[PDB]
Amino acid sequence: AMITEKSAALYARAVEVMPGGNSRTAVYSSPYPVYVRSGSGARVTDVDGVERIDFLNNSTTLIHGHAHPEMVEAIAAAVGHGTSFGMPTPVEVEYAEALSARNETFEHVRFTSSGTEAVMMAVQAARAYTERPKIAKIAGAYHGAYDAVAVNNDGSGNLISHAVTGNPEGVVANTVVIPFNDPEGSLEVLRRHADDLACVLIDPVPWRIGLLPASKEWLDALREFCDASGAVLISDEVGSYRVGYHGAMQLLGAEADITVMGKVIAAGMPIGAVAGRRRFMSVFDPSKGKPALPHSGSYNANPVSMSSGIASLRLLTPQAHERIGQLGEQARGSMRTALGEAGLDWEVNGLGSLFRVVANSAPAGYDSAAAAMKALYWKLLENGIHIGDSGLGCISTPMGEEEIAEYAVAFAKSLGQVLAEGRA
Amino acid sequence: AMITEKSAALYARAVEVMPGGNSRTAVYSSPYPVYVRSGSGARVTDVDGVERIDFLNNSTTLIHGHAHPEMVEAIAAAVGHGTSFGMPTPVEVEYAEALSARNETFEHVRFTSSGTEAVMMAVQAARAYTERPKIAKIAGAYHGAYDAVAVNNDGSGNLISHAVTGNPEGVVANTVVIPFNDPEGSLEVLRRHADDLACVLIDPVPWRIGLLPASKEWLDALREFCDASGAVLISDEVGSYRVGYHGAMQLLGAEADITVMGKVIAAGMPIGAVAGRRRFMSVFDPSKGKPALPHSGSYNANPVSMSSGIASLRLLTPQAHERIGQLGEQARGSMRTALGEAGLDWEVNGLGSLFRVVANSAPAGYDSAAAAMKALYWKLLENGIHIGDSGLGCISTPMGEEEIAEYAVAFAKSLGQVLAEGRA
Ligand SMILES: *Cc1c(COP(=O)(O)O)cnc(C)c1O
Ligand SMILES: *Cc1c(COP(=O)(O)O)cnc(C)c1O
């Protein structure tokens, strides 16, 4: 049914100049992905001219959807004054104040060009502050490609370290993993390494292991352990910040030492941020001699990304936050009803404007739950909707009741088609 | 003489929300840096309203200067169609072809959001391809903050490993350093580690150790060593690419296995690139199963950065390249004449549109060569010119003969003031 000829032609060119025609693993699909030309509001038009509602929003980055007029105005004006400089600008100060105001723990901030960089610098900061080597992270959680955190980062709960080909033992031996939401099992691992732990790195709502929130009992156990041991508690909220108006830890009743942010904080332009209590951030301070931790980067705090951020935060009011949460609750409820009516036990998880369909059974005609979910992803594309290929999705502020209603119709239709094709 | 009151007021706000009021170590100056508001062409206007000629251009990023009208048009149009997407776009393919065309070795490309990320991914690729742990880099050369390369990265030629506080031994033990332009001493180190070397990471024209080019004898020794040992030869040209129309290795008569690029390739928007022969890049290919080296990132290949890149490369013609090289030669000659007339032995190095004044003596009244150069940096600011605080500078394509003439007058004046103030 779908026409993807212009996508296929782009792919044929791409494979000659990129490895497998790809520049970002997560956007690839076999045999080739759909390529897109433009977006407006909640919708994206592919290169074959087909307009669809976007329910993933650049991996949850685009909290204000595509080309929001107020963001476009702010970004284009900044571009016109100069894209980047070898000197700081007024907008970096304005934006640091705006971000710092969102949570009491965000006392001092520094900007990067990506969440990947920000996680790296947060880990480096903890290592510099403590002068200890090890880090603990959640088994299965993703934090980007930096080698110390690219360990057990693919959704598995396995507690044995597992890393990318070529990541040396000298790196891997200094990262250990803990079981999400299991305080007892987590403390067993943490206490074995306490003297040597620089940090405990968490995501409070990690999607790859199911998009369930961290529990109070687990957060409290980790906070107490960090206080007793001197390890720094780092909350990577690059993806999960958006669940709360003051971020994810605050929504769940807890405080990080350092928080890593990105994605929605600029809602489409390259950025990351490290924000935390002054003492932890002091490793970066260059004002009283050489810093313990140098941290540069050509685009850090560039005024285009800062202007995107100012506009994103200004649009992300308490009212807007509440509204996209209500739409998210409605979407999750409708998915659960459709799954139930189709005889499927799959979970629908999420908080606020985030959701994930977690396929946990293989219906007839599919070799695995993951293959059935990939089929649902493709059927949803055919039926006018973009979600993730393992069930992730999200609401954007240009959406209203009609987009969520259209999604519900498409979701039920698509599920029926997936199941019928499997039984055929 | 200089009025910096609006800069001081921005700094007073900044210190409350950033560590030492800073987000990028390299742009800090004591007691505070000059803040800037906008740029146009070759000039930048500070927050106090003072327009100066920019001879550093965001650490050599802005090859086309500030807010070039053709770059602004391309970038603003891209922004209007959507800043980033969870799907590939036509412009990533167009830009990959444009970049790949610049050098025969750039067979397959992948994009990142920074040179820092690109260097990290190049090293990871070499480790994945070879399954060996160690890397060799130049003693003193900078490659960004990634921990494996943030070793001996501050201009010193010392051959003993030296790293940032907190970088663990498990990282540092797998990075060794070699003496720039000393084939004999380099091969002594390399041969000690040959069985375990994933890569030899060079910059062919590293500024922090003097902005002298790699010699043919040294490049040949490294190429031969990599061919014999199986280590990957990685050329980090994030800063030095611009010396040649086909990049730095090609200008100097050599071939890398993988080249890292950034800065001028998009001339102001966040980017990096890893480009190399297909076999080395194959670790990233996701088209025939899971890749050996996953590599994602929310802004990879985003259409704003791709459009900046297309426009930057289209403006960077052979004619434009030759012209900025002629202006660079003229600027370097005028600096040497002024230094000679002032009785100073400082070097002026560089190729093409890059230069660096390398202070190597402490004139009367200065505690060090570095302090005298910092004084020259501040005097040049007072006299209407931005350069780096350790002597780095560069030409941009909006410059012509009048900017280089004004620079020469300011440089001679400033040098006289520095020396007279020291003798007073
Ligand atoms: C997106 C994400 C990252 C990586 O951020 P980029 O900006 O894509 O480099 C890091 N951590 C988590 C938890 C994320 O969701
Ligand atoms: C600029 C530079 C880097 C870092 O690139 P960013 O884009 O600033 O992160 C890496 N290597 C070298 C040699 C550079 O000049």
Author numbering:
A (entry chain A), B (entry chain A): 0 to 423
The article reads:
Residues 3 to 417 were located experimentally; the missing nine residues we assume to be conformationally flexible. Electron density shows that PLP forms a Schiff base (internal aldimine) with the active site Lys 262. The resolution of the structure allows for visualisation of extensive hydration at the active site and water–PLP hydrogen bonds. The equivalent residues in ForI adopt a different arrangement creating a cavity (pocket) adjacent to PLP. The substitution of Met 248 in GSAAT by Gly 238 in ForI also leads to a more open active site (ESI†).
The predicted active site of ForI comprises residues from two monomers, indicating the dimer to be the functional unit.
